[PDB]
Structure 1
Amino acid sequence: EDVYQNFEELKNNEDPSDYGVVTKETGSPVLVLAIHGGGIEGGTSEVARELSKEYSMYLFEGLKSAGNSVLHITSTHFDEPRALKMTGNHEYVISLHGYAEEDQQIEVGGTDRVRAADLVEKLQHAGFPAVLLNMDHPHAGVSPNNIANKSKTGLSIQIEMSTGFRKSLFGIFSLKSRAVTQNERFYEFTEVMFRFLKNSYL
């Protein structure tokens, strides 16, 4: 259970300096969505920001020194207005998440079954620890109420990255220092993603 039931509630209870909404609109069909950025699911801000070099981006980040877990709103409740706008303005959505787990793993779900499977094959071929989640899996992200699915098509890819995988991409795994300690494994991962996104959406 989240602390807040929707964005309006979070906005009314939290100081505006303790979170940040960040957008980049390029007209790309694909939107990169990271609604649990900053300290909420560490590393998702950095992956989103790197992909935003080629793709439109929506980012919601928790900016507290601690206690960012209170800022987590599950995808089916996440209704921040700038996210509703940007998702509706795009054809397809890739949404980035983190979950708790020491082993390195990436779970790939979403409503776009064909492209999710293709992504998992490309990740595995490239040497990353990706599994395809199917429709009855809990991290599947297939609800129409899921922010990632409120696009022009309803087709999403949901990328859920374990703590271990996320910690592997940074010299120093802190709010302050991830963005300035991205390592060779960070760029290798984001390269596989850029390669995939350019090919899979034409």
Structure 2
Amino acid sequence: EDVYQNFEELKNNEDPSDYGVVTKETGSPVLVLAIHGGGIEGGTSEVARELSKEYSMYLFEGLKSAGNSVLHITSTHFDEPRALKMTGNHEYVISLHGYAEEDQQIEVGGTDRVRAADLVEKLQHAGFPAVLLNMDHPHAGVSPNNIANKSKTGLSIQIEMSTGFRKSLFGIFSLKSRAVTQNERFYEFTEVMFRFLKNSYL
């Protein structure tokens, strides 16, 4: 259960300094989406911002010192207006999430079945712990109500990264210091992503 059922309710209940919506619009067909950024699913902000060097980006960040879990709105309820505009303006969506798990794992889902499979293969061959989720797996990212699928095509890749995998990418795992302590593994991972996105979406 989320604390809030939609963005309007969150906005009505939370101080605006405690969260932040950030966009980068470049006209690229692909949109990188991180609706659980900041301290909600830590590290998804940093991955998104790095990929924004080449792609359009939507980011929703929890900015509290603690308790950002209350700002999580699940994808099928996430209706912040700038996200609705950005998703609808793009052809494809890559959506970044984090789930609680100490082992390093990357779970890949989404509606774009051939691209999701390719990504898993590329990640595996590059030495990263990716698995493909299929359509009946929980949190497979296939609902039409999922914000990531409200694009021009409906084709998405949903990347869920375990806590252990995200913690491996930063010297200090905090809101304050993740961005400035990105390590060699962080750039190795995002370079595999850059290579995949450029090849996969021509």
Q: Separation in 2 of the partners of 1:18 and 1:122?
A: 37
Q: Separation in 2 of the partners of 1:174 and 1:82?
A: 26
Q: Separation in 2 of the partners of 1:44 and 1:11?
A: 21
SS at match of 1:86: helix
C-alpha deviation, 1:114, in angstroms = 0.2
C-alpha deviation, 1:134, in angstroms = 0.1
C-alpha deviation, 1:161, in angstroms = 0.1
Q: Separation in 2 of the partners of 1:57 and 1:199?
A: 19
Q: Separation in 1 of the partners of 2:180 and 2:47?
A: 12
Q: Separation in 2 of the partners of 1:168 and 1:137?
A: 26
Tell me the number of residue pairs that the alignment of Structure 1 and Structure 2 aligns: 202
State the TM-score, normalized to the length of structure 1. Answer: 1.00
SS at match of 1:76: helix
Alignment partner, residue 76 of structure 2: 76
Q: Separation in 2 of the partners of 1:188 and 1:139?
A: 26
Q: Separation in 2 of the partners of 1:67 and 1:125?
A: 37
Map residues 1-202 of structure 1 onto 2, 5 A cutoff: 1-202=1-202
Q: Separation in 1 of the partners of 2:139 and 2:49?
A: 23
C-alpha deviation, 1:24, in angstroms = 0.1
C-alpha deviation, 1:170, in angstroms = 0.1
Q: Which runs of 5+ in 2 are unaligned?
A: none
Deviations 1:78-102 (A, max 9, x none): 0000000000000000000000000
Q: Separation in 1 of the partners of 2:136 and 2:160?
A: 16
Deviations 1:51-73 (A, max 9, x none): 00000000000000000000000
C-alpha deviation, 1:189, in angstroms = 0.1
C-alpha deviation, 1:181, in angstroms = 0.1
C-alpha deviation, 1:139, in angstroms = 1.9
Q: Separation in 1 of the partners of 2:112 and 2:182?
A: 29
Deviations 1:175-200 (A, max 9, x none): 00000000000000000000000000
Deviations 1:111-162 (A, max 9, x none): 0000000000000000000000000000200000000000000000000000
Q: Separation in 2 of the partners of 1:145 and 1:125?
A: 33
Q: Separation in 2 of the partners of 1:139 and 1:113?
A: 14
C-alpha deviation, 1:32, in angstroms = 0.1
Q: Which runs of 5+ in 1 are unaligned?
A: none
State the TM-score, normalized to the length of structure 2. Answer: 1.00
| Moved beyond 4 Å, runs of 4+ | none
SS at match of 1:79: coil
Q: Separation in 1 of the partners of 2:139 and 2:126?
A: 23
Q: Separation in 2 of the partners of 1:84 and 1:25?
A: 13
Deviations 1:13-54 (A, max 9, x none): 000000000000000000000000000000000000000000
